[PDB]
C-alpha cells in the first residue's frame, strides 16, 4: 500500500498526468514530485518521498488544476467579500471568525485588496466546513491527508475555500491543525496564487505548524507579481 499511497498521490496532485504528456513506471512522476516539493531528485520511491506523501497537506493540485476555470484567475475588483457559510464545532464561533479575519489581514497588508465579511452567497469568497463529499465533486478524505482546498478567483465556486471538518481544528498548539495557518494558505489560492516549491513558504502545499509570521518572501513576491 506504500505503492498504493504513491500512485494516488502522484495522480491526485497532477504528477502522473504531466508524466504522461512527456511520454513517461513511477520514476518520471516521482522526479517531478521531488522537483515540485524540493526533495532530493532521485526518481525513486525512497524514504523522504514516502514521508512527504504521508504528510498532511492542501488538497489543491500542484501541477495543473482541479478543472478548467473561468476567466484569468485574478480578482478585477479591490474589495473582496467573504461569507462564513458554516462553522466547525471544534472552536468557538468568535475564535473561528477571528482566525479567518487574521488570515485575510495577512494578505490585505501586502496587496491593494481589502476583505469584508458579508452574509450571503453573493460573496466573492464563500467559506465552508465540510466532510467527504460536500457539494463540489472534490470530496474530502476523512482524518488527516488533505486538510482543505480552495479555488482561484472568478465567478461561482471560484474564489471559495473549504475546510475538512474531519480534521480537529484548533490554533495549532497542543492538538489539531491551525485554522489560521490553513486558512491563510487557502486564501492565497482564493486570490490566485499557486503552490510554492519553497518549503518554508506559506504557499508550500504541506502543513507546517509555526508560531512565526506566516508570510515569506516567496508568498509576498507571488502576490506582488499578480496585483
Q: Residues near 207 by Cβ (< 8 Å), separated by ≥ 6?
A: 55, 56, 57, 58, 147, 177, 181, 182
Active-site pick, 20, 44, 186, 211: 186
CB of 216 to Ca ion, least distance (A): 25
* Cβ distance to Zn ion smaller for residue 18 or 126: 126
Round to whole Å and give the CA distance between 70 and 26. Answer: 32
Site for Zn ion in 35-74 (CB under 5 A): 58, 60
The answer to whether residue 172 forms part of the interface with Ca ion (CB under 5 A) is: no
Residue selected from 62, 164, 186, 219 as contacting Ca ion according to rule CB under 5 A: 164
Cell of 192: 490566485
The region of 104-112, 113-121, 132-140, 167-175 touching Zn ion under the rule CB under 5 A is 132-140
Choose among Zn ion, Ca ion, none what residue 160 binds, the Cβ cut-off being 5 to 8 Å by kind.
Answer: Ca ion
130 marked as part of a ligand binding site = no
Round to whole Å and give the CA distance between 36 and 19. Answer: 13
Q: What are residue 170's DSSP bridge partners?
A: 178
* Cβ distance to Zn ion smaller for residue 26 or 53: 53
Half-sphere exposure of 111 (CA within 13 A, CB side): 30
Helices (H) and strands (E) in the chain, counts: 7, 7
The answer to whether residue 159 forms part of the interface with Ca ion (CB under 5 A) is: yes
Residue selected from 162, 190, 191, 196 as contacting Zn ion according to rule CB under 5 A: 162
Residue nearest to Ca ion (CB): 159
Residue among 182, 151, 137 at smallest CA distance from 164: 182
CB of 24 to Zn ion, least distance (A): 26
Choose among Zn ion, Ca ion, none what residue 219 binds, the Cβ cut-off being 5 to 8 Å by kind.
Answer: none
* Cβ distance to Zn ion smaller for residue 19 or 165: 165
CB of 27 to Zn ion, least distance (A): 26
SS3 content of the chain, % helix, strand, coil (to 5): 35, 15, 55
Round to whole Å and give the CA distance between 204 and 194. Answer: 9
* Four-residue CA torsion sign, 47, 52, 54, 60: negative
Site for Ca ion in 73-132 (CB under 5 A): 88, 90
* Cβ distance to Ca ion smaller for residue 189 or 216: 189
The answer to whether residue 219 forms part of the interface with Ca ion (CB under 5 A) is: no
Residues with a catalytic annotation lie at: 186
Amino acid at each position: 500500500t506504500d505503492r498504493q499511497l504513491a500512485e494516488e498521490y502522484l495522480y491526485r496532485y497532477g504528477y502522473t498526468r504531466v508524466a504522461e504528456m512527456r511520454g513517461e513506471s513511477l520514476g518520471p512522476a516521482l522526479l517531478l514530485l521531488q522537483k515540485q516539493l524540493s526533495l532530493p531528485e532521485t526518481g525513486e520511491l525512497d524514504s523522504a518521498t514516502l514521508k512527504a506523501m504521508r504528510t498532511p497537506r492542501c488538497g489543491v493540485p500542484d501541477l495543473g488544476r482541479f478543472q478548467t476555470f473561468e476567466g484569468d484567475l485574478k480578482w478585477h475588483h479591490h474589495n473582496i467579500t467573504y461569507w462564513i457559510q458554516n462553522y466547525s464545532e471544534d472552536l468557538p464561533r468568535a475564535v473561528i471568525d477571528d482566525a479567518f479575519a487574521r488570515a485575510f489581514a495577512l494578505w490585505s497588508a501586502v496587496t491593494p485588496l481589502t476583505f469584508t465579511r458579508v452574509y450571503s452567497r453573493d460573496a466573492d469568497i464563500v467559506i465552508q466546513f465540510g466532510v467527504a463529499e460536500h457539494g463540489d465533486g472534490y470530496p474530502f478524505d476523512g482524518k488527516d491527508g488533505l486538510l482543505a482546498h480552495a479555488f482561484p478567483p472568478g465567478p461561482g465556486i471560484q474564489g471559495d475555500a473549504h475546510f475538512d471538518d474531519d480534521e480537529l481544528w484548533s490554533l495549532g498548539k497542543g492538538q489539531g491543525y491551525s485554522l489560521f495557518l490553513v486558512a491563510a494558505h487557502e486564501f492565497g489560492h482564493a486570490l490566485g496564487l499557486d503552490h510554492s516549491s519553497v518549503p518554508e513558504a506559506l504557499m508550500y502545499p504541506m502543513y507546517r505548524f509555526t508560531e512565526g509570521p506566516p508570510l515569506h518572501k516567496d508568498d509576498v513576491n507571488g502576490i506582488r507579481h499578480l496585483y
